[PDB]
Design a protein around this ligand. Structure first.
Ligand SMILES: Nc1ncnc2c1ncn2[C@H]1O[C@H](COP(=O)(O)OP(=O)(O)OP(=O)(O)O)[C@@H](O)[C@H]1O
Ligand SMILES: [Mg+2]
Lengths: 220, 225
């Protein structure tokens, strides 16, 4: 009955109102922990990780209520009532669920098959560039247009994947393995800190950067 | 308050008893996907802007949060309600190694930002935009090195392109956006767009009898929207 402390908590709470996006990618990573926990069978987590997941949805309950759209009990209206009871296209059956990079590469393959690709390397590359241009361009406006930045940050990732394809590599992996090499070195580095006894907030960035250097020229 | 009519049907549905085939046959390890799928529809709407779908949809999600809460409480771990009071207790009290415990599951984009926000909170990070960006550049160049040899070393090649990607998340963030999200959006805009060309190219009589046309209608759509 908490369920209510909780409604009466979402009415009432950065904080900020804000928005529905930025709201989104909080949900997303949240669902990701839920799933993480189930695979670890980690069950005490599971109880927080779903507080969390459930936290969001009270927002959407929230913000929705604030418009003609009718609020939380209503939410649990639809879903209730159900349980007692396009054209063409090369892009079909790409689950939405797929992660970003891989769903980008996947799309580009489709276009490729259907005859719609760059057909040499050069303008593939040309273009990562053109797009980095449009990104930095945006970024240094005296007043930034948040959207157009993000938009441009987009086009650049789709751009560079497209390069991953022409080189024949799979972008979602590559970067997986970059958090692998990265994750690796970095802990190498947390550890030779602690070997000194000093802390990791017991450093200056010079020391970090220079150990990190020690570290990577330690594979030859 | 319908919530209650909900918490139930769950009773009467995961019911020992009556029903059922098929809602009664679910572990956690298997609800898990439709939580993903739904989370994924739940943003489709708040990017499509679709307020009918979005009740209907949120509910199918609420519902998971409950589905777990039933099952949790069949093994007697906790009740939908304990779930409220975990958060209820843990919002309210805001009022009035740091790569441990970053998942794997998690997309490249999200986990490089995350890993990255992570070394940042122990200030391991770049201090100024300029040479974030530079290092992209630098890494691109690494890529083309790899990319041009008389004999390409495919392995090498992948790695250095790993890092191009990382670099570029290093930037997207720092430019204070979220890469995986920025990709999602771009992906959508594109997919929208081709789509159209495609419905343009069909309309287009028949052929039967390109490609620019192909590359042209594309740009002529670029403007159109
Ligand atoms: N096969 C292709 N041929 C031509 N262009 C392509 C191809 N694949 C991707 N592109 C890129 O070219 C298009 C134009 O790039 P751009 O970054 O200018 O986006 P835009 O919407 O046209 O303009 P802006 O980026 O300024 O909004 C994008 O849709 C992007 O996909
Ligand atoms: Mg662009």
């Amino acid at each position: 009955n908490q369920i209510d402390r909780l409604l009466t908590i979402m009415q009432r709470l950065w904080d900020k109102e804000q928005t529905f996006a930025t709201i989104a990618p909080y949900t997303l990573e949240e669902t990701y922990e839920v799933l993480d926990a189930i695979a670890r069978e980690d069950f005490d987590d599971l109880r927080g990780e779903l507080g969390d997941l459930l936290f969001q949805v009270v927002f959407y309950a929230q913000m929705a209520q604030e418009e003609g759209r009718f609020d939380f009990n209503d939410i649990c209206a639809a879903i209730s009532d159900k349980l007692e009871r396009a054209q063409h296209s090369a892009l079909d059956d790409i689950p939405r669920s797929l992660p970003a990079l891989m769903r980008a590469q996947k799309i580009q393959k489709r276009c490729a098959n259907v005859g719609f690709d760059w057909t040499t390397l050069g303008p593939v590359v040309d273009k990562v560039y053109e797009e980095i241009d449009e990104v930095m361009y945006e970024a240094r406006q005296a007043v930034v247009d948040q959207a157009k930045l993000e938009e441009e940050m987009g086009d650049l990732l789709f751009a560079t994947v497209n390069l991953a394809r022409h080189l024949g590599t799979k972008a979602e992996i590559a970067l997986q393995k970059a958090n692998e090499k990265f994750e690796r070195r970095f802990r190498e580095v947390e550890r030779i800190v602690a070997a000194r006894g000093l802390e990791m907030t017991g450093v200056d960035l010079e020391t970090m950067e220079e150990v990190w250097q020690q570290v990577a020229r330690q594979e030859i």
